[PDB]
């Protein structure tokens, strides 16, 4: 009884943005937390 699990155990990418304007404020490459 559980939906598809999505683990971020490998180096991922992250993009924080302001949707309405499409302004990519910050970007990231997390290789090792």
């Amino acid at each position: 009884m559980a939906p598809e699990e999505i683990i971020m155990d490998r180096p991922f990418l992250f993009v924080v943005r302001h949707n309405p304007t499409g302004t990519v404020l910050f970007m990231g490459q997390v290789m090792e937390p």
Binding site: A2, P3, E4, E5, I6, I7, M8, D9, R10, P11, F12, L13, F14, V15, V16, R17, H18, N19, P20, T21, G22, T23, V24, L25, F26, M27, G28, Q29, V30, M31, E32, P33
Partner: protein, 346 residues
Amino acid sequence: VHHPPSYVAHLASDFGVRVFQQVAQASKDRNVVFSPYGVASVLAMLQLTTGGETQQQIQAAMGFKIDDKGMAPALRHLYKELMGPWNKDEISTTDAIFVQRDLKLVQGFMPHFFRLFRSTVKQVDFSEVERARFIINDWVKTHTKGMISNLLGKGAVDQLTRLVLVNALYFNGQWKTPFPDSSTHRRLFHKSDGSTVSVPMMAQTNKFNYTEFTTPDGHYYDILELPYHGDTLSMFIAAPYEKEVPLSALTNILSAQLISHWKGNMTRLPRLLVLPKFSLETEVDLRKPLENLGMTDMFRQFQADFTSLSDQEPLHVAQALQKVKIEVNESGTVPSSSTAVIVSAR
């Protein structure tokens, strides 16, 4: 015709997302938190101080001219829409320019620069070295709210220094559906070299805007959106399905358009998201990344054209950099970057 700030917003970000790519391909196995918007802000300012081929390269790279019709007023409405209380999540961008008071500026530069950008303008004497960086480093400090306490290292500026255009971005978002403390547990993170580590990861069962995106090679990547309670800002997560395929293949095709496309194909699906919390802090040298995008001249002496600012002496960017910092936890995200260009100070 599309909403003006949304158009300038794209171009600014696009440029930034292409600068990141240079920084990322240079930092292949190390952590990199960058600010696309941050680099765009100071380069736009630089567009006015420069001339000749130097200025043209920057406009070719960026993709627009801060001079053109309706261009600057649009960048200003962008500053506003971004910092509006209606976003619930707090943003705070601010640009500043520090010029040597005894620098004979060309005619019209000062008022014109202010009419277009309308930001902080400070006349400082760089001969008084320590006091000078105390003026700027403290400016950055207050506008990034404590984050980034010392943007300029000792000797990053000097008596020969003339111009310093800096940007200070701040963001304090809070997850629309924050991660439960209890759910935080140690899990294994597989490094880009093969080794694993026990890192405290956050977990959450909910319905996220998810979408699968294939790469030209044929690799599948997961794209997920975690919004902040303002529902106007959000962080997009993108990792591969297979662990064999590196983050490189994803980042090499990145673009402000590809991000819009993800956001456009998403559907709220039930998922159990387990994301490692983290607190990065990075300083990037924008020299090489910029030249890789065409702006070589501004770094080369006896080639760099700054005739729009002054002309009593030849000038050039002694250095360009960006110091970012991001704290991601159970409640939200508080990232803050401070990007600066320095003319006549290595």
